[PDB]
Design a protein around this ligand. Sequence first.
Ligand SMILES: Cc1cc2nc3c(=O)[nH]c(=O)nc-3n(C[C@H](O)[C@H](O)[C@H](O)COP(=O)(O)OP(=O)(O)OC[C@H]3O[C@@H](n4cnc5c(N)ncnc54)[C@H](O)[C@@H]3O)c2cc1C
Ligand SMILES: Cc1cc2nc3c(=O)[nH]c(=O)nc-3n(C[C@H](O)[C@H](O)[C@H](O)COP(=O)(O)OP(=O)(O)OC[C@H]3O[C@@H](n4cnc5c(N)ncnc54)[C@H](O)[C@@H]3O)c2cc1C
Lengths: 105, 105
Amino acid sequence: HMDVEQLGRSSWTLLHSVAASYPAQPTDQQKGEMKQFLNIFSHIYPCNWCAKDFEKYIRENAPQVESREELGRWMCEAHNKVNKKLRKPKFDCNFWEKRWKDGWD
Amino acid sequence: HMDVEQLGRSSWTLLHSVAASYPAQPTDQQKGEMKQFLNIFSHIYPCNWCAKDFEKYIRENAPQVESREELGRWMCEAHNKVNKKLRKPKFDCNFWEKRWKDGWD
Ligand SMILES: Cc1cc2nc3c(=O)[nH]c(=O)nc-3n(C[C@H](O)[C@H](O)[C@H](O)COP(=O)(O)OP(=O)(O)OC[C@H]3O[C@@H](n4cnc5c(N)ncnc54)[C@H](O)[C@@H]3O)c2cc1C
Ligand SMILES: Cc1cc2nc3c(=O)[nH]c(=O)nc-3n(C[C@H](O)[C@H](O)[C@H](O)COP(=O)(O)OP(=O)(O)OC[C@H]3O[C@@H](n4cnc5c(N)ncnc54)[C@H](O)[C@@H]3O)c2cc1C
């Protein structure tokens, strides 16, 4: 059984929350585990076509893990690629921090 | 900002969904990435006390990744440890597959 909407909202909540909690100056270790986290996520995400695309996205636009600001923007753009594919409106990445780090809306 | 309830429900949805999609006979690779996924998750989960505990849980009761049936039960019991800590009722792990693999309730 696949409930792709609830799984999708839940999973974006988790991804954007992890990027909002990420350091502005990450350790070399924090950078490496974030890259691996994201790669593995793309292998095991339980919505099979969802997974492969996001996995090609990670290969063609590698996660930017040098800081919170870069990672958050990266996530916002990864999510917007999926929004475009689904004919949903674009999210203003200028407001990624207001939404996910400060928690407004 | 930390909204631990929505983040928590979202994150359990993702974890139980990944275990429901896991093979009954996983490849050696699938086993290794699941272990690493879970370890990294426990490092980066954005609710700091939540994270450390679950990380000690993974060290004291290592993820059982040999099959879907074992992994799903493991996840159910990991979640029940947190339910106990929060004075929520215990979930019947006998019904883990009905809930998360078949999608009823
Ligand atoms: C990696 C991944 C790939 C997916 N691929 C597919 C797919 O191929 N086909 C499919 O049908 N579904 C896919 N899904 C599901 C889809 O993305 C949506 O989650 C689902 O349709 C639910 O949509 P929603 O309108 O409730 O909000 P969601 O798109 O899940 O958004 C949740 C909330 O995030 C905020 N938000 C929206 N856009 C952004 C952004 N760019 N940056 C930051 N915050 C934002 C908004 O506040 C929004 O309400 C995928 C999910 C994930 C995690
Ligand atoms: C790893 C982790 C650690 C956390 N630690 C804390 C913490 O220390 N303190 C804190 O306040 N919050 C913590 N949270 C949040 C907490 O677990 C809940 O998610 C949150 O309180 C929301 O509760 P809920 O009643 O909406 O349902 P949740 O507990 O999130 O459950 C979601 C749904 O899962 C199903 N379910 C319930 N139990 C099980 C089970 N054993 N197996 C399978 N399915 C089940 C039910 O259908 C339930 O509605 C943590 C979350 C995670 C992911």
